[PDB]
Amino acid sequence: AVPKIEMNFLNKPIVPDTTKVISNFLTHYLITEPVEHVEIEAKLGTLIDLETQNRFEFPVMNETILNPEFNLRTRFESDMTASEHKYLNEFLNQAFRDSQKPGRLPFAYKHTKQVDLFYETEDKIRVSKNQSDNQVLACVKKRRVADLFLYCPNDAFDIRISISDELPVSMPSGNQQPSLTRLKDRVGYVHQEIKIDLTKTTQNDPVYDTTERHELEVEFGNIADLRDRAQKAKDGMEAPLFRRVQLFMDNVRILRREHS
Amino acid sequence: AVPKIEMNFLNKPIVPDTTKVISNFLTHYLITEPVEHVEIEAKLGTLIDLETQNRFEFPVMNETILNPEFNLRTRFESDMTASEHKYLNEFLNQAFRDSQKPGRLPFAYKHTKQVDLFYETERDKIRVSKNQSDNQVLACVKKRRVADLFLYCPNDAFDIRISISDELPVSMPSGNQQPSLTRLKDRVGYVHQEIKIDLTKTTQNDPVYDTTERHELEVEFGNIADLRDRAQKAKDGMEAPLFRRVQLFMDNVRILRREHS
């Protein structure tokens, strides 16, 4: 009853620093100082050095989590070229098809075309409706809680891990006009309750030409369960939280590395 | 054949950046421009910023491999404290005893007590290694540093240096020539899955200053030929067997590095 290979001389699952740090990060805003309507999402983009106004440069060789004291010195563009976006789009569709094979855990697909309306308050209230029948999908007030920035010198994309609060508020008055209106094309892939959204947003302006920004983000689709796992981590047993984070971050790594 | 969970949405093994960088680093000195008589060793220690003259500090929150440009403005100290060495020694002994349990892959144990004599050449030194007991010559080599990878570890008490060396075997020095330096070297070696972990005490002397014995812990590849073969496959496309080996290597390095009182 002896194995062929052991993963280490302890024959134990070892967790890298990256996973532990992100795990403690989430646990702080899941259990320690709880966010009532939390939204955890990692976005692909470029990290910008505020001094050079170009992509952040650091003498490192691997995926690196910066200290929060560097957040004040950098900026994060959540944008992406149409070419990069399409390349990721095709890759994901291929992965989607392969997951339909026998023995695989299937991908879920959901394509939405919706309108975002922003209303002033008495910060803004965001209202989401379908472009087709104008039925209200959601009406929230989003608050930025905390951010974790990952510099990725080996890839074409850096990553921002954001924690937010989507406070559900009532529909604004029927006579108030939206401050801003933007169309959004959202291609959502779901695998193991982990969400992968390809978002395409057209922005109109009274002066500038219309621009269309491209985004990709990975999101936890089961907050209640992630909360439960993070609870145990706070208690003592932190294995299921580590695995969930590791799975989350590994999906992120795959997408990030996917560039022409 | 529906499983409960998958490692990722690709259902394929995903290798982190660190393993990939280190693998490429090894491949460059095993296949691309092969160092002859190569010795791959990773030492726990302390990365020193030459400017601050203290331990390197970085606004990062995880294991970080430095660019090469830093190697000329930082230095490394492989010497740790005796209490740290003892703490690691006891930890390895328990891991040793646990690996003998049924179902596990056994540790191997090897404790050597040797003497290192250093002679001059015309520029490095020639190292002659002999046992203390029978005073029999074990090795006679000219060692040359070739390349270094530095891993800053802000969460642990130890940093990591991965060095590549040319350990050229040479002729024994002239019998009537005396050693320039003489030091005793106690070594406790553990071997698991052909990965060598060596605890080392080295007592030394000095004409002027009172000196002490230093303490070191290093991790080394057992079968250097197998590491070459895997690296050859990786260069030819199939990188998986090299990755698993480097992963296993670094994981063992991780465990020891995180072991501190």
Side-chain angles (χ1 to χ4, degrees), chain A, chain B residues 1-122 124-261:
Chain A
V2 304
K4 299 190 177 185
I5 312 291
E6 292 186 352
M7 298 307 168
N8 45 71
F9 64 78
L10 291 185
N11 192 38
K12 273 177 48 191
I14 261 59
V15 176
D17 280 22
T18 295
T19 305
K20 286 187 178 181
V21 169
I22 297 171
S23 299
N24 297 339
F25 175 64
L26 300 182
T27 309
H28 179 263
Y29 298 96
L30 280 174
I31 273 75
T32 300
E33 183 181 331
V35 179
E36 198 150 344
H37 300 90
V38 69
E39 185 181 20
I40 313 288
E41 54 197 9
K43 296 196 176 185
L44 265 53
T46 75
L47 197 60
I48 306 295
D49 194 321
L50 288 178
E51 289 176 335
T52 65
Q53 220 60 226
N54 301 326
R55 187 181 183 183
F56 183 72
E57 285 190 10
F58 219 46
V60 306
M61 305 282 285
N62 65 287
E63 169 185 305
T64 314
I65 302 178
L66 301 179
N67 262 112
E69 287 76 10
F70 230 117
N71 301 20
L72 196 72
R73 310 189 181 190
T74 61
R75 180 171 54 85
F76 190 87
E77 291 186 1
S78 181
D79 202 13
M80 175 194 307
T81 83
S83 182
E84 288 165 339
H85 193 254
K86 186 58 182 180
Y87 185 87
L88 285 168
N89 200 341
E90 300 183 13
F91 169 79
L92 279 169
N93 285 338
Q94 185 58 41
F96 159 82
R97 271 167 291 173
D98 299 329
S99 70
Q100 309 306 327
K101 284 176 178 176
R104 286 296 316 279
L105 293 179
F107 255 97
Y109 183 95
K110 181 56 181 181
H111 188 183
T112 53
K113 303 176 179 181
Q114 62 184 34
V115 186
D116 272 18
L117 296 84
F118 297 87
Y119 294 70
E120 266 295 333
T121 54
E122 57 182 350
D123 49 322
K124 292 173 181 53
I125 296 182
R126 189 229 306 159
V127 177
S128 296
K129 305 186 284 81
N130 290 324
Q131 300 180 13
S132 63
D133 50 17
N134 288 277
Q135 54 186 353
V136 173
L137 266 50
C139 185
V140 305
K141 186 182 300 177
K142 188 161 180 173
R143 168 172 61 99
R144 184 63 60 95
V145 179
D147 292 326
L148 263 193
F149 296 97
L150 280 72
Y151 171 58
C152 310
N154 288 315
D155 312 286
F157 302 102
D158 303 285
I159 293 152
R160 177 227 290 172
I161 299 180
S162 60
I163 297 188
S164 299
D165 181 46
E166 283 186 341
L167 177 59
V169 301
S170 292
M171 291 295 302
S173 49
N175 300 331
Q176 183 182 6
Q177 285 302 97
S179 304
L180 186 64
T181 290
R182 54 171 61 151
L183 263 52
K184 289 180 62 179
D185 179 81
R186 202 170 195 89
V187 177
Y189 300 90
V190 182
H191 185 268
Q192 294 181 123
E193 289 180 341
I194 288 187
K195 308 168 69 175
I196 305 177
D197 301 336
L198 282 166
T199 301
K200 220 144 53 180
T201 299
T202 51
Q203 262 292 151
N204 292 275
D205 192 278
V207 184
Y208 320 134
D209 292 13
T210 297
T211 175
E212 181 192 24
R213 77 155 55 212
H214 308 76
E215 297 184 297
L216 184 152
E217 64 170 1
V218 185
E219 185 177 359
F220 286 102
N222 198 337
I223 288 302
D225 169 83
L226 188 64
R227 182 102 62 184
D228 183 40
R229 295 167 180 264
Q231 181 69 254
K232 308 178 186 184
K234 189 63 143 52
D235 289 338
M237 38 187 177
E238 37 204 292
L241 178 65
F242 283 162
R243 289 189 300 268
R244 195 60 187 173
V245 169
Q246 190 76 46
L247 168 64
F248 176 85
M249 292 302 300
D250 284 339
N251 290 336
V252 178
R253 292 186 176 89
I254 292 178
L255 298 173
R256 176 186 66 207
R257 290 167 173 179
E258 199 64 28
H259 190 283
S260 67
Chain B
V2 174
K4 298 186 178 60
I5 61 179
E6 294 183 344
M7 46 192 71
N8 51 68
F9 67 79
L10 282 187
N11 199 38
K12 284 308 206 109
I14 286 308
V15 173
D17 276 17
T18 298
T19 299
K20 288 198 177 186
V21 178
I22 295 176
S23 291
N24 293 325
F25 175 73
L26 301 181
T27 300
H28 177 276
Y29 296 97
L30 286 171
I31 272 71
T32 306
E33 190 160 336
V35 174
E36 305 189 301
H37 317 94
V38 65
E39 186 179 27
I40 323 287
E41 47 197 340
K43 301 183 184 182
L44 277 66
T46 296
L47 189 65
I48 296 297
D49 194 331
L50 282 181
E51 195 146 350
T52 71
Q53 216 58 233
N54 294 273
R55 187 185 179 186
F56 190 84
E57 284 203 25
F58 235 16
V60 310
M61 301 202 299
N62 59 283
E63 174 179 305
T64 290
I65 300 179
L66 304 182
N67 246 334
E69 59 183 350
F70 255 160
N71 305 21
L72 294 179
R73 48 192 297 176
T74 194
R75 61 170 171 86
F76 195 87
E77 294 185 349
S78 61
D79 179 29
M80 68 182 61
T81 77
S83 57
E84 286 169 337
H85 194 257
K86 185 169 179 297
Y87 189 87
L88 290 158
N89 204 327
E90 294 181 1
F91 172 77
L92 285 168
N93 286 335
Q94 186 59 38
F96 170 85
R97 293 183 286 270
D98 290 333
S99 74
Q100 310 306 330
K101 291 182 176 181
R104 287 289 309 281
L105 297 188
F107 255 101
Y109 190 94
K110 190 70 173 181
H111 187 180
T112 67
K113 304 180 180 178
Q114 305 173 2
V115 174
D116 292 343
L117 296 318
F118 293 85
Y119 299 83
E120 293 189 17
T121 185
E122 298 299 326
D124 290 333
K125 299 295 189 64
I126 305 180
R127 177 173 58 93
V128 180
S129 291
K130 302 160 60 183
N131 291 118
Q132 300 182 5
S133 60
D134 54 34
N135 200 255
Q136 186 60 269
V137 184
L138 296 173
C140 178
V141 294
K142 257 196 60 182
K143 188 155 171 289
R144 172 176 59 101
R145 192 74 64 88
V146 179
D148 300 286
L149 259 194
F150 294 107
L151 281 74
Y152 171 66
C153 308
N155 302 323
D156 304 317
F158 298 101
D159 292 317
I160 305 297
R161 174 176 70 188
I162 303 178
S163 54
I164 316 298
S165 299
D166 192 321
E167 203 170 27
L168 174 63
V170 300
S171 54
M172 292 286 299
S174 304
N176 297 135
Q177 179 177 341
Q178 57 191 12
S180 298
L181 195 60
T182 294
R183 53 174 57 151
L184 274 56
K185 202 160 186 177
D186 169 271
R187 185 187 307 264
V188 178
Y190 301 88
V191 173
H192 188 263
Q193 293 183 131
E194 289 175 323
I195 294 190
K196 304 180 177 297
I197 308 179
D198 304 288
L199 285 169
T200 298
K201 304 172 185 175
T202 301
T203 78
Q204 46 210 18
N205 291 280
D206 181 84
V208 177
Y209 311 114
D210 306 17
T211 191
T212 57
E213 60 173 10
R214 56 164 55 217
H215 304 68
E216 291 174 290
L217 200 167
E218 59 171 343
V219 189
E220 200 173 359
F221 288 94
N223 190 10
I224 205 58
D226 173 80
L227 185 68
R228 179 108 61 194
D229 187 33
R230 294 170 181 255
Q232 179 57 60
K233 299 179 185 176
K235 193 56 177 294
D236 295 339
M238 302 173 57
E239 317 181 50
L242 172 61
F243 287 160
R244 298 190 301 265
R245 196 59 180 166
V246 175
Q247 182 69 45
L248 173 57
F249 181 86
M250 297 307 302
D251 275 21
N252 290 339
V253 171
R254 234 177 299 277
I255 297 179
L256 299 172
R257 183 184 72 205
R258 295 175 173 181
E259 210 60 36
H260 191 287
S261 63

